[PDB]
Target: CTP synthase 2
Amino acid sequence: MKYILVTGGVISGIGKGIIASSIGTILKSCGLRVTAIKIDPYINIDAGTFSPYEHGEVFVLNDGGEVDLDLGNYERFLDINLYKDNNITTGKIYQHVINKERRGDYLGKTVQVVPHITDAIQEWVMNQAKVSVDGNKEDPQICVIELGGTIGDIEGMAFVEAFRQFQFKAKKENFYNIHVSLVPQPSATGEQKTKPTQNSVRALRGLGLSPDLIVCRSSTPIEMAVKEKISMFCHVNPEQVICIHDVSSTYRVPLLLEEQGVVKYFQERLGLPLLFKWKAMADRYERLQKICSIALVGKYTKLRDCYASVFKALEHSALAINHKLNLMYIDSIDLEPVTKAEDPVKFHEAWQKLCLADGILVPGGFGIRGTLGKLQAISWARTKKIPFLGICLGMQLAVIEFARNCLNLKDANSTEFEPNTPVPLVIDMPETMRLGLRRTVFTTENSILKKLYGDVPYIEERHRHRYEVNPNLINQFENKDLCFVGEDVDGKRMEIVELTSHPYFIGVQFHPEFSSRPMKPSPPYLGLLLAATGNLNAHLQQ
Amino acid sequence: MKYILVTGGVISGIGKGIIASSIGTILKSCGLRVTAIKIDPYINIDAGTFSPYEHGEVFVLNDGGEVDLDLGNYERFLDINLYKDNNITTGKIYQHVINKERRGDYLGKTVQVVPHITDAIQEWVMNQAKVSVDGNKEDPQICVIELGGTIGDIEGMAFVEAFRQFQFKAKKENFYNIHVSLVPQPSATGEQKTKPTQNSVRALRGLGLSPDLIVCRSSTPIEMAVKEKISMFCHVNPEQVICIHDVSSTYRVPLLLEEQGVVKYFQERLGLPLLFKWKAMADRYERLQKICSIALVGKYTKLRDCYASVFKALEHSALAINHKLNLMYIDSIDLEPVTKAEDPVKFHEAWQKLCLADGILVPGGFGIRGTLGKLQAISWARTKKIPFLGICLGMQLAVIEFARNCLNLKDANSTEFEPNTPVPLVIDMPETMRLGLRRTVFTTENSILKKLYGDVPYIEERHRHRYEVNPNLINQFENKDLCFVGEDVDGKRMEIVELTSHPYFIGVQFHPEFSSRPMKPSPPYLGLLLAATGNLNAHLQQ
Amino acid sequence: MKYILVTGGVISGIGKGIIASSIGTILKSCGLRVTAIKIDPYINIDAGTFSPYEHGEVFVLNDGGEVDLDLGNYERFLDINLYKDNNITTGKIYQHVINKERRGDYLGKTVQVVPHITDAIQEWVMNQAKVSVDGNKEDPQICVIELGGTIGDIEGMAFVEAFRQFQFKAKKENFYNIHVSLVPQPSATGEQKTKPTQNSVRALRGLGLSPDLIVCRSSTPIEMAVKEKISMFCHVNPEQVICIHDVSSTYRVPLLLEEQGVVKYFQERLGLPLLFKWKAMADRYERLQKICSIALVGKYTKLRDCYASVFKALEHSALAINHKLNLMYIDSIDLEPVTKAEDPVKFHEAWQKLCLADGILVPGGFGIRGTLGKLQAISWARTKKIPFLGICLGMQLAVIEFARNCLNLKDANSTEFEPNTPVPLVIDMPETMRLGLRRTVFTTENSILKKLYGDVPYIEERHRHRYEVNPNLINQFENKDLCFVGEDVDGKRMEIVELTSHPYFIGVQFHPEFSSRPMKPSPPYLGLLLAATGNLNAHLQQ
Ligand SMILES: CCOc1cncc(-c2ccc(C(=O)NC3(c4csc(NS(=O)(=O)C5CC5)n4)CC3)nc2)n1
Ligand SMILES: CCOc1cncc(-c2ccc(C(=O)NC3(c4csc(NS(=O)(=O)C5CC5)n4)CC3)nc2)n1
Ligand SMILES: CCOc1cncc(-c2ccc(C(=O)NC3(c4csc(NS(=O)(=O)C5CC5)n4)CC3)nc2)n1
Ligand SMILES: O=c1ccn([C@@H]2O[C@H](COP(=O)(O)OP(=O)(O)OP(=O)(O)O)[C@@H](O)[C@H]2O)c(=O)[nH]1
Ligand SMILES: O=c1ccn([C@@H]2O[C@H](COP(=O)(O)OP(=O)(O)OP(=O)(O)O)[C@@H](O)[C@H]2O)c(=O)[nH]1
Ligand SMILES: O=c1ccn([C@@H]2O[C@H](COP(=O)(O)OP(=O)(O)OP(=O)(O)O)[C@@H](O)[C@H]2O)c(=O)[nH]1
Ligand SMILES: NC(=O)CC[C@H](N)C(=O)O
Ligand SMILES: NC(=O)CC[C@H](N)C(=O)O
Ligand SMILES: NC(=O)CC[C@H](N)C(=O)O
Ligand SMILES: [Mg+2]
Ligand SMILES: [Mg+2]
Ligand SMILES: [Mg+2]
Model:
């Protein structure tokens, strides 16, 4: 096997996941079966505990793993599906080692970080790198390991020590360390500063890893003097120092690595014998003259990474229909009448952006905060015939609103927001949390989604929810405009709803965005973009 | 005595010198006599060896110290004059300690970094902090020490160890550590990243210093969440974390520290009882509607810091006459006919900027590179009657040009550019280098500079030159338009020249820019700005 | 070329110089021409400034280098003669780099530890390793570099960084790092503790060197469990972990390395094709039943390392005549009547040891402290016919005493102890200090030393002195028992004196001990050991 370790130097937020994913898609073009592992040095077992504002969107895997968004980037660049154990955390490692100790598996000897934690990491990495994520009954050739955090993070030091050892178990032909670092330029009249990269590589060397490649992130391109200053003071050849400046799209990041010679480096060092798909999507993305204005009405809008996969799925869809996406992130609390009292400028900005909405997206979330603002946007969408996609909570709120406003059941809500709701429409219906891949079956042939999903009887989609539509109260909707077109295989759960009277007003209980790929956009997001540009009927008839 | 130690975290180029200078001018307003020390962890004894591209302009002190530009910032914010020993370097320390060892001053014991290097630093700091730079026969109250470099720089670690010890010799009431750090934001849709500041403070704590203040440099203002994240993870109270965002001028940096509570902190901690001058200059700077376009025709233009003091002296002058400065930095090699062959777009950009020149500045430099381009600009200035200031080399080149073009001595040059020049006009005339403060005497009453300098008989100005006008060949100029109005006290050196036939064509052999202050602009630069705006005759008659 | 770097872990005083020397003599037996370099991370240029109590005896080289005793160990194990530049210090490096900077040799760039100090070290090491110390007109094959200090010493970190770089300039076949560490055992009922060795190797790895060999110093032999614990936690194979327990002699240390497999390791790794001399001397040393009791009457007795080379020269001599050496170190201040008042038990112990003296040695030193005690011992030796060797000061004191007690010139002394001595017998006679190799010529055929030195006309011996016998006052001695048998080639200096009336009372102005080798004992020390055992006349007639 081959292993690539991507390390981060100065700060985490430099697109180290996109570098790792781009390295993977380059190797994939070179004919390697690629898997990926994300190491997150946090003590948390899973991302299911997190606020979105902390690390971005909680990505959901088929097995019900709640993990970091970087696992989603692997799945978008490489058409793989990952498992829980492709996320390693300090929590998982320390728990595993503790559990072994209590059984006596360490033979009455003192358990300590070296060897026992570092051995657990190596064991995990070896054994999970052998697991097929590619959908082939064949072990992959190469694992890209991303070491999340920075090389200054004390929690990460066990992992770097593990990789120091692993570099001398697996041979130097099998192990490549890539170091992603920031080169800041505080003003355009000042130089690009290399010192943080020098200092970071000195730390990395102190922990026993030598960069094979150093990936210098900057705004503007790196000057040759600055490249030589990195070469000298990081003790590395100029061929190994690559410049990843800011660009138009992720689609160009593989190409920029190709241009900077990374493909050649890997071909030489691995002994191999292209990115035309990437270049096609990249060049196409520039040439788009048309705009689709989509409103994302989201409580977590304060950091755009909180809706990363959702935005990506819109862009996949928008690219496929040759439109630019104007994604109007609207903080839903600004649409609420509270903000009309307290800060009315934000309210009339938010509602103006909602007027300019060619389509409306109401993504998921947990809690009652911002939920009245979501209901305002859904009311607007329903009545003014503006294309609507509701995901999880956005389905629940649409069903609730239709009950309130069209069935006159104004008392209707969820047992999340008001537990003692008079007519409990949206109830907790556990399996625990309905988490991971589940089979949803269509029970209405004339549904728009069935056609978009390719006239299939069932779909398998990723869920992350506790609450459901209360199956008795479905009788209220029975012969009205709002039809529950998709159910679970066990029938008692409604997982898709459509308004029959609207061009596109779709609620799905699942999260389609996790299943979205560049050359296979998630059908619900496609329908939205199509409807918003009138092209829906054309696409359906074609 | 009191000591303030300003340390830098992530990178040096964050304006740590301006922070240190602003701290000084705040304390000066609080009635303290302030001195300053710059520590430069380089092995170089002095900056006299440097290329300008390395560390910026070589600042010259009255005693003939060739030092860093940060010593010039102290002199501009605090109306002090510094000495050689206010620059400490690793070179100076190690040499001093070596010289002591050879004499036997360390009593036959093994000389090592702790104690002997760290003791030498403490000795130097104590004894030089007692030296009056303020022009008063009274020892100062407070020393601001700037530790240049970063807290990751291995050369600096001896100094940090020295200050750890010094903090326990001088008491905690006498010693304040300020830490200046970068908080980067790689995109405006991403968060402000604190991790480099956390990591830097952890290093600083590891070396035994605790920040009293942490000065977070960013582009945009720091969010309260980010301020709290610094407070928690740097283990410091929110009152100690101050935000220095980007602003219009240096004039606002003292005020921003005042607003962020630094003045209050120092008043409380030092037990003291305002910046109205700074606020006046700041608010005035914004309100300027008029523009003066000055051409700086300079070989070192590639980094603007290579002409820092010169630019500052122009801005002092421009502010005093209520004009904005458009400083057109022109790389002089672009004006040369070589670039008309090789890259003619740069040539016609450069010459266009030279057409738009309300005044021309030809600053100093060493070597023949770019010098033909300087001669092109001086020829333009002389003939088209555009206001000219030549500094050192710019005087030499003007005298050379007048000989070539007005006395027809086309063979005339310096013994620097062509040693075996037929008529050696500009010769090496050592004292070594004419370096530091020298008395220049006016020997022509009707000189423009004498009036600008306040009708004084002599001036004392800072020199840094080897080459002079050859005193025999002065006979060629004797009764022509170009008059040598200023000479040395020993007569044999001509230190100022004027064209009598021009509104303002001045050459000075000294560097007036080092003597420039905000509320006392250097007279040669004033005359340029005045001439370029027609106001010269008005100012002279007033 | 090949390079071996010997590093020390926990403490310096573990015989790291003897390891380095033993490695050299092993390679010498394998047919390699070996040179050596000692790196001393002190800021001192030379050891000429030191007190003996600080680092042991100041060893003198032929060129007049005053260096560490470890250079003397190289010369005793390897029949080489070293030069000044085979001692590298931080002082020498920083001074060289400073001197380059002042000339402008670093081309106007900022001088800093990496690269410029680390490059200076590599330059020095390369160029001095090419120098022939072996007495052959052929460059050596291998340099043993001893990095003095510990791997925790901050002064040494520049050297370790230099060797990290050098390991990647010279190839891995050319560079071997040996790490000498302490394994303490605080009680015999407690385990041998490996943690300091683990921690030291972790530091060494952090600085970018991996041990090829780890040399574990202990009292008792290392247990196999402890050897495996080192193997695991130092991340090294058991073949690389060697046990150097305490043994009878230095003669066994090469053999112990041979047994532990070091010879095999080097044969394999260097690609080579024995220590019978060492084994002969070792086994002979055990079997010695006879004892010679020698008194060393020395002011520096408090640390035996202050007379290291002197003791070694006695042992070389004693081994050659099949006697054990009882070296009675006598602090000369204890023989003085002051100690008869203040602490009379020490006095009567000291004088008892001086009664049991089969021979007396009065070694050199600087100052008047302990010098009256030396005179007491010389008086005893002269009158009671006990074999005497005086070295430098011991010659001066004998000449002084003979003047006092035999010529009745009781006022006679040196201009060192009393500058204004009435009859200044021992005067300062500079060349500076008479330092390094000088030719001494015999001017008396019937001298005992001429015969011992092999009936040669002249000898070349190592000097380190300022003071001499005053050449006018030689007239007092002219026809008496004390004859100046050896002079300088320029005649005006007397460098050897003998009493004609005594079996062996020799003063030499030089230091013969520096020239002593195991299979070539220094003749003055031989004569002492022979005289003390009656064998002198037998050896002379043979
Ligand atoms: C090393 C990183 O360096 C740099 C340097 N400069 C710029 C960027 C950069 C980072 C993020 C984005 C971004 O998110 N762009 C969008 C998109 C569409 S599809 C997708 N991601 S994706 O499906 O995983 C992938 C398989 C196709 N992203 C439109 C939303 N665009 C630019 N990154
Ligand atoms: C902690 C630093 O943080 C920040 C944050 N934001 C911005 C700046 C900033 C840095 C430099 C400059 C600058 O150089 N401005 C000019 C000027 C005129 S006079 C003078 N300097 S001076 O005479 O020493 C001083 C006594 C008056 N500078 C016009 C040339 N302007 C802004 N610095
Ligand atoms: C790695 C060190 O580990 C250990 C472990 N155990 C013991 C010793 C040990 C250290 C010093 C001594 C010592 O000094 N012994 C003497 C002697 C005679 S000759 C000479 N040195 S010599 O001439 O340089 C060399 C070429 C022959 N030394 C009698 C004075 N004896 C034992 N060293
Ligand atoms: O103010 C000062 C004084 C001294 N120095 C010293 O100058 C040397 C260079 O320190 P820099 O921070 O300029 O580093 P660099 O040139 O290697 O990297 P970048 O500019 O690309 O970030 C170091 O030895 C440092 O301590 C400064 O950086 N700044
Ligand atoms: O990709 C990943 C995975 C894990 N982690 C881990 O998350 C934790 C936070 O790491 P961050 O780099 O987010 O640090 P921070 O929030 O303290 O500071 P800034 O964002 O303001 O710079 C650390 O424990 C780190 O190892 C990441 O940073 N990123
Ligand atoms: O009192 C205690 C408690 C805990 N520990 C812990 O036990 C583990 C072993 O710590 P040791 O000091 O026993 O180290 P070791 O066995 O690797 O090496 P030597 O004995 O040969 O020197 C480490 O994780 C340490 O923190 C102790 O050493 N002692
Ligand atoms: N994924 C989501 O949007 C969660 C929605 C809702 N809180 C539930 O648990 O059903
Ligand atoms: N300061 C300068 O501009 C130097 C000018 C010239 N090289 C001299 O030494 O005279
Ligand atoms: N080497 C020594 O013993 C020095 C002796 C005396 N102080 C001299 O210099 O002559
Ligand atoms: Mg963070
Ligand atoms: Mg720099
Ligand atoms: Mg010691």
